[PDB]
Design a protein around this ligand. Structure first.
Ligand SMILES: Nc1ncnc2c1ncn2[C@@H]1O[C@H](COP(=O)(O)OP(=O)(O)NP(=O)(O)O)[C@@H](O)[C@H]1O
Ligand SMILES: Nc1ncnc2c1ncn2[C@@H]1O[C@H](COP(=O)(O)OP(=O)(O)OP(=O)(O)O)[C@@H](O)[C@H]1O
Ligand SMILES: Nc1ncnc2c1ncn2[C@@H]1O[C@H](COP(=O)(O)OP(=O)(O)O)[C@@H](O)[C@H]1O
Ligand SMILES: [Mg+2]
Ligand SMILES: [Mg+2]
Ligand SMILES: [Mg+2]
Lengths: 890, 686, 67, 257
C-alpha cells in the first residue's frame, strides 16, 4: 500500500486527492512502524499490553445507533466515535511523543480527569489535543489567550460544550490575567467536578442527570465532553483535577522524515537528518531577530515548498521514472527561497556557511527570471535608477526586488522591513511598473500612513446613538475596490501601509492577512479581499509588532548594504542631467554634472568625506541620505545661481573655466555645510582640515581662518563672509527689540543656507541650544522674501496633527477643479511656510513614534495626505515646512 | 582555601603549623561526628570562654567539614542558650494549652501545612478529646463562603468552634474575613481554625492577626509508608486476589522512594517534581483496574500473570512521568519501575534495596495480607541512610552542607555604606582584567567555524565587560558624590548592597542564587580565558585556535562551542554534521597532543564515579576532577552500543537545571549501568 | 503646563490660546482698550500686535521652585 | 449674582441638537456635553448654598437646584430609552422573520415605538431644553418607556436562551449572531457565514434551486457530503428543528459512508 501510495503521489493529482494521499501515507507509515517494531518483537497474544497500548479500532455495523457503531480503544480507555464532520484537517505525524500524549490523555479521560500538556511553545501541545479530538470525531474548540478573550462568549461556550459534548482546549492558560484566570479556573473546576461525579462507583448507573452550575443556572453535562488546559503552573483549584504531561522536545527528525516521504522524496531519512539540525544551527548560529522563525511550523512550510518544487521540476522535465533528480538540491533551493528574503545582509554568508557545513558540495542557483529582469532594467533606466545583475553595482537591490516579487506570488499581506536609507519604496514602485508593462495589467498603489490618522478615522466609527456606520480610510479603499464601480478589478491594487506598525491599528487586520482574507467591521458588515489586492507593510525597524502580525506576512528585509552610495550618486547625476530644475538650464546642468563626475566616484572626495563624517559627533543621528540629499539640493541651488548669473549677463555668459572653478569651489563648500553642518565648530574645523588634506582642488590660503567661515563667489573665488555682513544702525526706540536682528557672520551664513534650502523647498530644522537665535533668524530670513507667508506654530508636549488640520482650515482652502483635491493657501502666488518650533518636543506614544512627525513625513515625502472627511487624497501645493528645536539631549 | 581564609583571624594565624603538627587530625576528618570532639587549634593567650570555645570550634567546623555545621550550631546554641533549648520542639505539638489559653478568641488559629499534607487531624482529635463540636466546612465551593459566614456567626453567638479547610483558594475573601474578625467577638470560648497550605497568595494582614502553625510530613521511608497505608482504606487492600496486597505494598514502597529522593534535589531528581497524593491515587486506581481486568475472579493468580508491562508503562509514561520532562529523570524512573515491578518481586529472595550501609540489604517481606506488610513497615530500623533510596551515603553530607550554606545566607539576609561600597568596587576593578579588543574579523580563513564562534564570544564578552566596567566606574564616581546619581544606578546600587547580582549584568546563564562576589570572580576567570583566546588568535591565527585547552565552564554558551567543533570537524575531510558522533577520551596529561579531530577540554568534574583509562568505577567521593577531556568526532559506523557503556549527562553548573550534551563512557565490568543511573552520576562543566 | 510660559516669554504671546469666538472677544476687548488709550480699528493683526506689546510691557509672571 | 445670570442665559438658550436617523426621526445628539454641563452646574450650586452670600439668594438657588435635579432625572433616563429604542428598532426592523417568532413582543414594540416617534416629533417642534421640561407628563412617559423596553429586552434574552437550549450549538455564536440567524431564516445566504463557528468542519450547506430540502454539507475547501435522506426545511420551518435534523442526518450519513 505504501509503495502504491508513493508511486501515485509522484504524479499530478488534484489538491484534495493530494491531501488524502498525504494523510494515507502518514497513517500507513505509522502503521508500518508499529507492526514492524512494537508488534513483531515476539508478540503472540491479543491481550498483551504491547498491543493494547496501541490505538485500536473496532467496527460493529449491526448496532442500530450510529454513535455506537465504531468503538475506539487505547489501553483500558473506551471511546465512541462522535462522527462529527471535520472536512479535511491537517494530520500530525504520529511521533512516539504523540503516542505518549495520546496514552496519557486517554488515561486521564477514562478517569474523568483533565489533561494538561504543559511545555515550551511550538512543541505541538495544542495540535496534539486537536488531533486526538479529531481521531475520536469530536468537535474541538481552541480558546486562544492572546488577549482575544472575554467572559460573555466564554461562559456560553462552556455551556455549549457541556450540552453538545465537544472538546475545549486552551492554547496557553497561564497567559490570562489573574482575575480572568481565577474565574475561568472556577468554571473549569465546576465542570470537571461534574465530570468526576458522573463516574461515581456507587452511581455508575446515572439516573438523575449530571448537572453543573454555569451562568447561574443548571446545565446538563454530556459525558463525551472534556476540557484541556495547555500550560507553559496549574491553579490550586485544578491541581487535583488535571493530569499533567511534559511535551518539551518534539521528535522533529521523525516528523521531517515522514513529511518528506509523503512528499515523494525517496531519501527522506537522510534529508530529515540533515534539515533538522540545520534548522537547529540556524536558530543558534544566526543573529537573534524578532522576525526569525525556525520552529516546527516553519520547517513544515519548508518541506511542503520543497515537495512543490520537486513536483514542478518533474513536470518541467516530463514536458520536454524521472527519479534521478538532485533531491538535496531541491531541498536547499526551497530552504533558500523561503528563508533568504527575511535574512539580514550579515546573516546571509552565515546561512550559506551552514548550508555548506550540513549539505556538503551542493549549490544553490536562483531563478534567472529573464522575462521580468529586462523589464526591471527598462523601468530602472526610465526612472534614472541604478540597475545591476549579480556582482555588479545594483545586484543586491535587483535580487531584493525579485524576492519581493516571489513572495508577492506566494502570498498576500507583504511586509518590507528595512532601516531608513534602503531602497524600499523604489523597489516596489519599480516592481509595480515592471509588472504593469510586462503582464499588461495596470497597477494602482494606495499609500496610507496609519499613524497620521486615528484608528477610528482609519477603520470607521459607529455613532453612539444613531448606529450609523461611516467607513474609514482603509475600509473605504477596500469597499471601492470590491464594488468595481470604475473597474478596479482586472488591475493590480496595492494597499501599502507606509509607516510603522504597533499592535493597535493592526488589531482588525489580523483577520485578513491570514488565510481568512476577511475584514470584520463592528457594525456587522464583512469584506472579502479580492485576489488581486496585496497589502504591504513598508516599515523601518519592526520592533513594536506582535508575533501574530509578523507570522502572517511574507517578509523581505532591506538592509542598508543593499543601496550602495555609488547608486545614490548615479541617481543624482542622472536626475541632474535629465530633469530640469524648472533647455539652457538643462545645458548648464549637463555641464555641472560633467565637472562633478570625477568627485562622485567609488573612492572620490565625497565618499571619503562621508566616511569621515560618520565618525564625528553630530547633534542628531547622522543618516546617509539626509546629508546626501542636503548636498544634492545645495548643488541644485548652485546650478540655479549659474543660470541666474547667466540671465543677469546676456552677453559673455558663464565660460567653461569659470564654471569649472565655481562648481569645484561650491562642491567643497557643500561638503563642508552638508556634512558636519549640524555639529560644533570644532567638528567643522576638523572636517575642513581633513578635506584640505585629501582634496586637490585649491582652497583659501589663509591658515588661521577656517574654510567654514568662507564662501565661494559667483566669479569662482573664495571670499570671506565677513565682507558681506553689513553695518547697521538700529533706531533708539528699537534697542534690543523683539524683532531687531543685527546681521552677523552667523546670520548671513544661515541666511544664505536658508535661501538655498527653500529654493528647492526642503523642510529644514535649526537645532541648537536655548537662546542661540533660531526663532529670530528664521523669522527674519523667511520674512525677507516677498512671496512667502509665515505661520508660527508652537508644538507642545501634547501636539497632535489636528493642530495642523486647524491651521490648514484657517489659512488654506480645498479646491476640486484639478485632477485631485488640492490644498492651497487662499492667497495667490504666496508660498505658505509653516513655522514648527520645538518640533522634537511632542511626546512619543507607547510604541516609540510621534504622530505629528509621521504626518509631516507623509506630507513631505508624498506631497499630500488623506483627509478623514470623505477619504480622498489631497495634494499639497504652495506649502512648505520649517522646523526648529533644542538638542535631543535636553 | 577555606583554611587560608580562616587563618586571616589573629587567633588562627598559626593554624598551618598547628594542622601540620597534629597527627590525629586526619582521623578526625573521617570521623562520623567531628563537632563532638574538635581539637584545640586556636592560639589565644587567654583561655577562651565556653562561648568563645564554641565559636572557635564552630569556625573550625566551617573550615573542616562544613556538613556538620548544623549539628555544631545546635551545640553552640546549647552551650549559650542552655541545653534542651530545642527539646520541646522535637516533642509533638500540644495545642491543648495553646487553644485553651495564650490565644484570644479574636485571633484566628492558622494551620499552615506543606503542600501534600493535611492538618485537620490534630485539631479534630483535639476537639474529640476536649468534647467540643466543630463545623467543618470546605471553602472550595461558592456556597462554602456563606456557609462559613453563617457557621461563624452561630459560633460567635453560641460559643462553639468553626473549621475552615483549604482557605488559600480565596485570598480576597480571606481579607474580608480578617476585616470582619477585627470587630469585637463577644464570646470567649469561640475558636476559629483555618486549615491552609503554604501559599503566598494568602494576605499578609491575616497572617499577622493570627497564630501560625506549620506542619510538615515527618521524614523517613517508614513514616511515608505508614502515611500511605493509612490514607488507603483497608477494604481496598483486602479484596479480590491476595496478590493485590503485595502490589499495593510495592506501590507504596515506590512512592516512598521517589518522594524522599526529592529532598536531594540536585542529586537524585534534578528538579523538584510534585509527586503528590494525586499521583498515588491514580497509580492505585490503575493497579486496581488492571488487576480486576486480568483476574476476573477472587482466586489468587500467579505472579507471572500479573500485567507487569501495563503497570510499568502506565506509571512511567502516564502516571508519575507526565511531570517528568528531561530524559534522564525519565530513565531513572523507568529503572526504578523495572527493578521493583517485576515477577521476581513475589519470591522470598527479593531485595528492595541493595548495598545498604555497605553490606546490609532490605529484604522483601514474605507476606500475603495487609497486616503482615504493615507490621513489617513499623519494624523498619530508624537508622535510614540515603543508600535505601539508591543514592550514595554522602548524599546526606552534601545536603547538610547545602543547608549550612543556606543558614549562613539567611543570617546574612537579616543584618554609612559609602566607604564599604567604595572599597569593594575598587577591589573589583583591581580584580577584573581591564578590557579585551576584537582582534578578529579577518576576511581570510573566515570559513573556520571555531574562528567565527570566537568572534561572537569575544564580541559579547567585551561588550558586557565594558558595560560592567562603566557601571562600576560610575558607582565609584558617585561614591564620593562627584556626580549625579540616576534611577538605573539607584537600582544597581540597591542590588549591590543587598548582595544580589544585577539583572542588567546577567547576559549569560547563571546558577540560581549567585551572590555578586562569586559572579565577579567567575567573570574575571572568563575574561582571562578570553584574553588568552584573543592573544592566541593574534599570535597564530585560525589554525592555532584549534589547539586550545578551553574550559567549558568559562564559556558563556558551551553548546555553541560543541556545534562549532562539529562544524570544524565536518569541514575538514568534507563530512556532514549528521554523520559525526562524539567520543570522549579522558587523559591524564593537561597538555596531551591533539590529532586532527581532538579538542581539549578542562574543568569537567565527575560526581559519583572515578575515571581511569576511559573506564568508570563507582566511588563514594564526589567532584572527581577530570584532568583533560579530548572530544573527538568520528564517522558514525551505524552500530548498536554495547551494554557496558552509559550515556552520562553533562550539565553546566551544580544546579542540574540545564543540559549541555551527553557523553558515552565505558564502565568497569563489575558495575552495571542501572547502579550508575540510580546514583545520579553526572559530569559538570563548573 | 510648561513651554506655554516659554512661548509667552520668548515672544510675549501664546498663539494657541486665541481662536474662534475667544479670538473675536479678544479683538472686541482690544477695541475697548485702544479706545481707552486713543487708537482706532486699524487692522485686526495690528490690534493683536498692540496686544502683544502691552503684554510684553505689563505682564510679569513669577514662578517659584525648590532647589 | 453674576453666576446665576450666566446660568439663566445658558439654560434659557440651550438647544438640544437632533440628528436624522434613517429618515424616521430626529434623535438627540450631544449627550456627553449636556451631562457634563448639568453635572458641573449642580456641583457649582452645591458649592454656592455653602457660600456665606447664599442667604440673599436662597430661594433662587433652591429653585435652580430643583430644576437641575429635574433635568438630570429627565435626561438620565432619556439616554437610556434612546439606547434601548435604537437597539430594539435595529433588531426588529433589519429582519422580517422576527415578527413571526415573537408576535406579542413585536406588537408591544410597535406600540412603544409609535409613542416614542410621537414624543420625538413633539420634542422636535421645540428642542429648547426648558420647552422640553415643561411638557405635560414627560417623566412618567419616559419611565414607562424605559420599563416596557426593559421587559421586552428581558423577554428577548429569555427567548434567545430558549433557542440556545433547543439547539446547543447556538451557544458558540454570539447574541447578535444568533439574532441574525433567527431573524434571517428565510434567506440562507447570510446563514452560511455562521456555520464555521457552530460546526467543526462544515462551512456551508448545499440546498435546492429554491432552497427547500438540505441536500448536504460542504467543508471550507469545497469537500462535500451528500445526505442519504435529505431533510426538508419546508417540513420543519423552525431553525432549531431542521438544524437538529441536519446534525443527526450528517452523523447518520457519515456512519453509512
Ligand atoms: N542677530 C541678532 N540680533 C539681535 N539679537 C540677537 C541676534 N542673534 C541673537 N540675538 C539674541 O539672542 C537671543 C535669541 O533669542 P531667541 O530667538 O529666542 O533664540 P532661541 O534659541 O531660538 N529661543 P529658544 O527657542 O528658547 O532656543 C535673544 O536674546 C536675542 O536678542
Ligand atoms: N537603484 C536604486 N534603488 C533604490 N533607490 C535608489 C537607487 N539608486 C538611487 N536610489 C535613491 O536612494 C533612495 C531610496 O529611497 P527609498 O524611497 O527607496 O527608501 P525608503 O526605505 O522607502 O525610505 P525611508 O528612508 O523613509 O525609509 C532615493 O533617494 C533614490 O533616489
Ligand atoms: N506530532 C507532530 N507531527 C507533525 N507536526 C507537529 C507535531 N506536533 C506539532 N507539530 C507542528 O508544530 C506546530 C506548532 O504546534 P503547537 O500546537 O502550536 O505547539 P504549542 O502548543 O507548544 O504552541 C504545528 O503547526 C504543528 O504542525
Ligand atoms: Mg503556539
Ligand atoms: Mg519609503
Ligand atoms: Mg526659539
Amino acid at each position: 500500500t505504501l509503495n502504491v501510495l508513493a508511486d501515485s503521489v509522484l504524479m499530478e493529482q488534484p489538491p484534495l486527492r493530494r491531501r488524502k494521499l498525504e494523510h494515507l501515507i502518514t497513517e500507513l507509515v505509522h502503521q508500518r512502524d508499529v507492526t514492524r517494531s512494537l508488534i513483531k518483537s515476539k508478540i503472540d497474544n491479543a491481550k498483551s499490553f504491547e498491543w493494547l497500548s496501541q490505538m485500536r479500532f473496532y467496527f460493529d455495523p449491526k448496532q442500530t445507533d450510529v454513535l455506537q457503531q465504531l468503538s475506539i480503544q487505547m489501553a483500558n480507555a473506551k471511546f465512541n466515535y462522535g462522527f462529527e464532520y471535520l472536512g479535511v484537517q491537517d494530520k500530525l505525524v504520529q511521533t512516539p511523543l504523540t503516542d505518549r500524549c495520546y496514552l496519557t490523555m486517554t488515561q486521564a479521560l477514562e478517569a474523568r480527569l483533565g489533561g494538561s500538556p504543559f511545555g515550551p511553545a511550538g512543541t505541538g501541545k495544542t495540535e496534539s489535543v486537536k488531533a486526538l479530538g479529531h481521531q475520536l470525531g469530536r468537535f474541538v474548540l481552541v480558546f486562544n489567550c492572546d488577549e482575544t478573550f472575554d467572559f460573555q462568549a466564554m461562559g456560553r461556550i462552556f455551556v455549549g460544550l457541556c450540552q453538545v459534548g465537544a472538546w475545549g482546549c486552551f492554547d496557553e492558560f497561564n497567559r490570562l490575567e489573574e482575575r480572568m484566570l481565577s474565574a475561568v479556573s472556577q468554571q473549569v473546576q465546576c465542570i470537571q467536578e461534574a465530570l468526576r461525579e458522573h463516574s461515581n462507583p456507587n452511581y455508575d448507573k446515572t439516573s438523575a442527570p449530571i448537572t453543573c452550575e454555569l451562568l447561574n443556572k443548571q446545565v446538563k453535562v454530556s459525558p463525551d465532553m472534556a476540557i484541556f488546559i495547555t500550560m507553559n503552573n496549574l491553579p490550586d483549584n485544578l491541581k487535583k483535577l488535571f493530569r499533567s504531561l511534559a511535551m518539551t522536545k518534539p521528535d522533529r527528525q521523525l516528523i521531517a522524515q515522514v513529511m518528506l516521504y509523503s512528499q515523494g522524496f525517496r531519501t527522506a531519512e537522510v534529508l530529515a537528518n540533515k534539515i533538522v539540525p540545520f534548522f537547529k544551527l540556524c536558530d543558534e548560529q544566526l543573529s537573534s531577530q524578532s522576525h526569525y522563525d525556525f520552529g516546527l511550523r516553519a520547517l513544515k512550510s519548508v518541506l511542503v515548498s520543497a515537495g512543490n518544487v520537486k513536483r514542478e521540476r518533474i513536470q518541467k522535465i516530463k514536458r520536454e521514472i524521472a527519479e534521478n533528480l538532485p533531491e538535496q538540491e531541491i531541498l536547499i533551493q526551497s530552504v533558500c527561497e523561503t528563508m533568504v528574503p527575511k535574512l539580514v545582509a550579515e546573516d546571509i554568508p552565515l546561512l550559506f556557511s551552514l548550508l555548506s557545513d550540513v549539505f556538503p558540495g551542493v549549490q544553490y542557483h536562483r531563478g534567472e527570471m529573464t522575462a521580468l529582469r529586462e523589464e526591471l532594467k527598462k523601468v530602472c533606466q526610465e526612472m534614472y535608477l541604478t540597475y545591476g545583475d549579480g556582482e555588479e553595482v545594483g545586484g543586491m537591490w535587483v535580487e531584493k526586488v525579485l524576492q519581493l516579487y516571489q513572495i508577492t506570488q506566494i502570498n498576500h499581506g507583504l511586509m518590507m522591513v528595512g532601516p531608513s536609507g534602503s531602497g524600499k519604496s523604489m523597489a516596489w514602485r519599480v516592481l509595480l511598473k515592471a509588472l504593469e508593462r510586462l503582464e499588461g495589467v495596470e497597477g494602482v498603489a494606495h499609500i496610507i500612513d496609519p499613524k497620521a490618522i486615528s484608528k477610528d478615522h482609519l477603520y470607521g466609527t459607529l455613532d453612539p446613538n444613531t448606529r450609523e456606520w461611516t467607513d474609514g480610510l482603509f475600509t473605504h479603499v477596500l469597499r471601492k475596490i470590491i464594488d468595481s464601480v470604475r473597474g478596479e478589478l482586472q488591475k493590480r491594487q496595492w494597499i501599502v501601509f507606509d509607516g510603522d506598525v504597533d499592535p493597535e491599528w493592526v488589531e482588525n487586520l489580523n483577520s485578513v492577512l491570514d488565510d481568512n482574507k476577511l475584514l470584520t467591521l463592528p457594525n456587522g458588515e464583512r469584506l472579502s479581499l479580492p485576489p488581486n489586492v496585496r497589502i504591504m507593510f513598508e516599515v523601518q525597524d519592526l520592533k513594536y509588532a506582535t508575533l501574530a502580525t509578523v507570522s502572517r506576512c511574507g517578509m523581505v528585509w532591506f538592509s542598508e548594504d543593499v543601496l550602495s552610495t555609488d547608486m545614490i550618486f548615479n541617481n543624482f547625476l542622472a536626475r541632474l542631467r535629465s530633469i530640469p530644475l524648472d533647455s539652457p538650464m538643462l545645458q548648464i546642468q549637463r555641464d555641472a554634472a560633467t565637472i562633478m563626475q570625477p568627485y562622485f566616484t567609488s573612492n572620490g572626495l565625497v565618499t571619503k568625506a562621508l566616511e569621515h563624517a560618520f565618525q564625528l559627533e553630530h547633534i542628531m543621528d547622522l543618516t546617509r541620505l539626509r546629508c546626501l540629499g542636503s548636498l544634492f539640493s545645495m548643488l541644485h541651488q548652485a546650478c540655479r545661481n549659474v543660470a541666474q548669473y547667466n540671465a543677469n549677463h546676456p552677453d559673455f555668459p558663464m565660460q567653461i573655466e569659470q564654471l569649472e572653478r565655481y562648481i569645484q569651489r561650491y562642491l567643497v563648500y557643500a561638503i563642508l555645510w552638508s556634512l558636519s553642518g549640524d555639529s560644533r565648530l570644532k567638528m567643522r574645523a576638523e572636517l575642513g582640515e581633513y578635506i584640505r588634506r585629501i582634496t586637490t582642488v585649491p582652497l583659501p590660503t589663509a591658515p588661521n581662518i577656517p574654510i567654514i567661515d568662507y564662501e565661494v563667489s559667483i566669479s569662482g573665488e573664495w571670499s570671506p563672509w565677513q565682507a558681506k555682513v553689513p553695518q547697521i544702525e538700529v533706531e533708539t526706540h528699537k534697542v534690543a527689540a523683539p524683532d531687531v536682528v543685527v546681521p552677523t557672520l552667523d546670520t548671513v551664513r544661515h541666511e544664505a543656507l536658508l535661501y538655498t534650502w527653500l529654493a528647492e523647498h526642503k523642510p529644514l530644522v535649526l537645532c541648537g541650544p536655548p537662546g542661540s537665535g533660531k526663532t529670530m533668524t528664521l523669522f527674519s530670513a523667511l520674512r525677507a522674501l516677498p512671496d512667502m507667508e509665515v505661520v508660527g506654530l508652537n508644538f507642545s508636549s501634547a501636539t497632535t496633527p489636528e493642530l495642523l488640520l486647524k491651521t490648514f482650515d484657517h489659512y488654506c482652502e480645498y479646491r476640486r477643479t484639478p485632477n485631485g483635491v488640492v490644498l492651497a493657501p487662499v492667497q495667490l502666488g504666496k508660498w505658505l511656510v509653516l513655522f514648527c518650533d520645538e518640533i522634537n518636543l511632542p511626546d512619543m506614544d507607547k510604541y516609540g513614534t510621534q504622530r505629528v512627525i509621521s504626518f509631516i513625513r507623509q506630507m513631505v515625502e508624498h506631497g499630500g495626505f488623506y483627509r478623514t472627511s470623505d477619504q480622498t487624497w489631497v495634494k499639497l501645493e504652495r506649502i512648505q515646512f520649517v522646523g526648529a528645536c533644542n538638542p535631543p539631549t535636553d | 582555601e577555606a583554611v587560608v581564609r580562616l587563618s586571616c583571624l589573629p587567633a588562627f594565624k598559626d593554624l598551618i603549623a598547628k594542622v601540620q603538627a597534629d597527627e590525629q587530625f586526619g582521623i578526625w576528618l573521617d570521623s562520623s561526628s567531628p563537632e563532638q570532639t574538635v581539637p584545640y587549634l586556636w592560639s589565644e593567650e587567654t583561655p577562651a570562654t565556653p562561648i568563645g570555645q564554641a565559636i572557635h570550634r564552630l569556625l573550625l567546623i566551617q573550615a573542616f567539614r562544613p556538613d556538620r555545621l548544623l549539628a555544631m550550631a545546635h551545640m553552640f546554641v546549647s552551650t549559650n542558650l542552655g541545653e534542651s533549648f530545642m527539646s520541646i520542639m522535637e516533642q509533638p505539638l500540644d495545642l491543648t494549652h495553646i487553644v485553651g489559653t495564650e490565644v484570644k478568641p479574636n485571633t484566628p488559629v492558622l494551620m499552615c501545612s506543606v503542600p501534600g499534607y493535611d492538618a485537620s487531624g490534630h485539631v479534630e482529635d483535639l476537639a474529640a478529646e476536649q468534647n467540643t463540636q466543630i463545623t467543618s466546612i470546605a471553602i472550595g465551593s461558592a456556597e462554602g463562603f456563606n456557609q462559613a459566614d453563617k457557621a461563624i456567626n452561630t459560633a460567635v453567638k453560641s460559643g462553639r468552634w468553626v473549621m475552615l479547610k483549604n482557605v488559600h483558594l480565596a485570598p480576597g475573601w480571606l481579607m474580608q474575613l480578617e476585616k470582619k474578625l477585627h470587630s469585637l467577638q463577644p464570646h470567649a470560648c469561640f475558636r476559629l481554625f483555618l486549615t491552609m497550605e503554604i501559599n503566598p497568595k494568602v494576605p499578609v494582614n491575616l497572617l499577622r492577626a493570627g497564630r501560625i502553625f506549620v506542619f510538615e510530613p515527618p521524614p523517613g521511608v517508614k513514616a511515608n509508608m505508614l502515611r500511605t497505608f493509612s490514607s488507603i482504606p483497608v477494604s481496598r487492600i483486602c479484596k479480590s486476589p491476595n496478590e493485590r496486597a503485595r502490589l499495593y505494598f510495592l506501590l507504596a514502597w515506590f512512592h516512598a522512594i521517589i518522594q524522599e529522593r526529592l529532598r536531594y534535589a540536585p542529586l537524585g531528581w534534578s528538579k523538584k517534581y510534585e509527586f503528590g497524593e494525586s499521583d498515588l491515587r491514580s497509580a492505585c486506581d490503575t493497579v486496581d483496574t488492571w488487576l480486576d481486568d486480568t483476574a476476573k475472579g477472587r482466586q489468587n493468580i500467579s505472579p507471572d500473570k500479573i500485567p507487569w508491562s501495563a503497570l510499568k508503562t502506565l506509571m512511567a509514561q502516564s502516571i508519575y512521568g507526565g511531570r517528568v520532562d528531561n530524559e534522564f529523570d525519565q530513565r531513572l524512573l523507568n529503572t526504578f519501575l523495572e527493578r521493583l515491578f517485576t515477577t521476581r518481586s513475589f519470591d522470598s529472595e527479593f531485595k528492595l534495596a541493595c548495598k545498604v550501609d555497605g553490606h546490609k540489604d532490605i529484604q522483601m517481606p514474605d507476606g500475603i495480607r495487609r497486616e503482615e506488610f504493615v507490621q513489617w513497615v513499623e519494624l523498619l530500623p530508624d537508622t535510614q541512610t540515603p543508600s535505601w533510596l539508591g543514592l550514595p551515603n554522602n548524599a546526606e553530607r552534601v545536603l547538610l552542607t547545602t543547608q549550612g550554606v543556606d543558614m549562613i545566607s539567611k543570617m546574612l539576609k537579616m543584618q554609612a555604606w559609602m566607604r564599604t561600597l567604595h572599597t569593594t568596587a575598587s577591589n573589583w576593578l583591581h580584580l577584573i582584567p581591564q578590557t579585551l579588543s576584537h582582534l578578529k574579523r579577518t576576511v581570510e580563513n573566515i570559513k573556520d567555524p571555531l574562528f567565527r564562534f570566537f568572534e561572537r564570544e569575544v564580541k559579547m564578552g567585551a561588550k558586557l565587560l565594558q558595560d560592567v566596567r562603566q557601571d562600576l566606574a560610575d558607582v565609584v564616581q558617585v561614591c564620593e558624590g562627584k556626580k549625579k546619581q540616576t534611577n538605573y544606578l539607584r537600582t544597581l546600587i540597591n542590588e549591590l548592597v543587598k548582595g544580589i547580582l544585577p539583572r542588567s549584568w546577567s547576559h549569560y546563564t547563571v546558577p540560581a542564587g549567585m551572590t555578586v562576589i562569586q559572579w565577579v570572580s567567575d567573570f574575571s576567570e572568563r575574561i582571562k580565558q578570553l584574553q588568552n583566546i584573543s592573544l592566541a588568535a593574534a599570535s597564530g591565527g585560525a589554525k592555532e585556535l584549534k589547539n586550545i585547552h578551553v574550559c567549558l565552564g568559562g564559556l558563556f554558551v558551551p553548546e555553541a562551542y560543541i556545534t562549532a567543533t562539529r562544524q570544524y570537524v565536518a569541514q575538514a575531510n568534507s563530512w556532514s554534521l549528521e554523520e559525526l558522533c562524539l567520543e570522549v577520551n579522558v587523559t591524564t596529561s593537561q597538555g596531551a597532543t591533539l590529532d586532527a579531530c581532538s579538542f581539549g577540554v578542562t574543568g569537567l568534574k565527575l560526581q559519583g564515579a572515578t575515571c581511569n583509562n576511559n573506564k568508570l568505577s563507582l566511588s563514594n567521593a564526589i567532584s572527581t576532577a577530570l584532568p583533560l577531556t579530548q572530544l573527538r568526532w568520528v564517522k558514525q559506523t551505524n552500530t548498536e552500543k554495547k551494554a557496558s557503556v552509559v550515556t552520562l549527562p553533562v550539565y553546566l553548573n551544580f544546579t542540574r537545571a540545564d543540559l549541555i550534551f551527553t557523553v558515552d563512557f565505558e564502565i568497569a565490568t563489575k558495575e552495571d549501568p542501572r547502579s550508575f543511573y540510580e546514583r545520579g552520576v553526572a559530569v559538570l562543566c563548573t | 503646563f510648561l513651554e506655554r510660559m516659554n512661548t509667552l516669554l520668548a515672544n510675549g504671546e501664546v498663539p494657541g490660546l486665541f481662536e474662534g469666538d475667544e479670538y473675536a472677544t479678544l479683538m472686541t476687548q482690544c477695541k475697548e482698550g485702544a479706545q481707552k488709550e486713543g487708537l482706532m480699528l486699524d487692522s485686526h493683526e495690528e490690534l493683536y500686535k498692540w496686544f502683544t506689546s502691552q503684554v510684553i510691557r505689563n505682564l510679569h509672571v513669577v514662578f517659584t521652585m525648590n532647589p | 449674582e453674576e453666576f446665576l445670570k450666566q446660568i439663566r442665559e445658558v439654560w434659557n438658550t440651550y438647544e438640544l441638537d437632533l440628528v436624522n436617523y434613517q429618515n424616521k426621526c430626529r434623535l438627540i445628539r450631544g449627550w456627553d456635553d449636556l451631562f457634563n454641563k448639568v453635572k458641573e452646574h449642580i456641583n457649582s450650586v452645591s458649592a454656592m448654598k455653602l457660600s456665606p452670600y447664599y442667604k440673599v439668594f436662597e430661594e433662587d438657588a433652591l429653585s435652580w437646584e430643583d430644576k437641575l435635579n429635574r433635568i438630570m432625572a429627565l435626561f438620565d433616563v432619556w439616554i437610556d430609552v434612546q439606547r434601548r429604542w435604537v437597539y430594539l428598532e435595529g433588531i426588529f426592523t433589519g429582519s422580517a422573520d422576527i415578527k413571526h417568532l415573537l408576535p406579542v413582543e413585536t406588537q408591544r414594540f410597535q406600540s412603544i415605538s409609535t409613542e416614542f416617534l410621537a414624543l420625538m416629533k413633539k420634542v422636535s417642534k421645540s428642542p429648547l431644553v426648558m420647552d422640553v421640561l415643561n411638557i405635560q407628563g414627560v417623566q412618567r412617559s419616559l419611565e414607562r418607556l424605559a420599563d416596557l423596553l426593559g421587559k421586552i429586552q428581558k423577554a428577548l434574552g429569555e427567548y434567545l436562551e430558549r433557542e440556545r437550549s433547543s439547539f446547543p450549538r447556538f451557544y458558540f455564536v454570539g447574541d447578535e449572531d444568533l439574532l441574525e440567524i433567527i431573524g434571517n431564516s428565510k434567506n440562507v445566504a447570510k446563514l452560511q457565514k455562521h456555520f464555521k463557528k457552530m460546526f467543526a468542519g462544515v462551512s456551508s450547506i448545499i440546498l435546492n434551486e429554491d432552497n427547500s430540502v438540505v441536500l448536504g454539507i460542504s467543508s471550507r475547501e469545497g469537500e462535500e457530503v451528500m445526505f442519504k435522506t435529505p431533510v426538508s426545511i419546508t417540513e420543519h420551518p423552525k431553525i432549531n428543528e431542521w438544524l437538529t435534523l441536519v446534525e443527526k442526518e450528517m452523523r447518520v450519513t457519515l456512519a453509512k459512508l
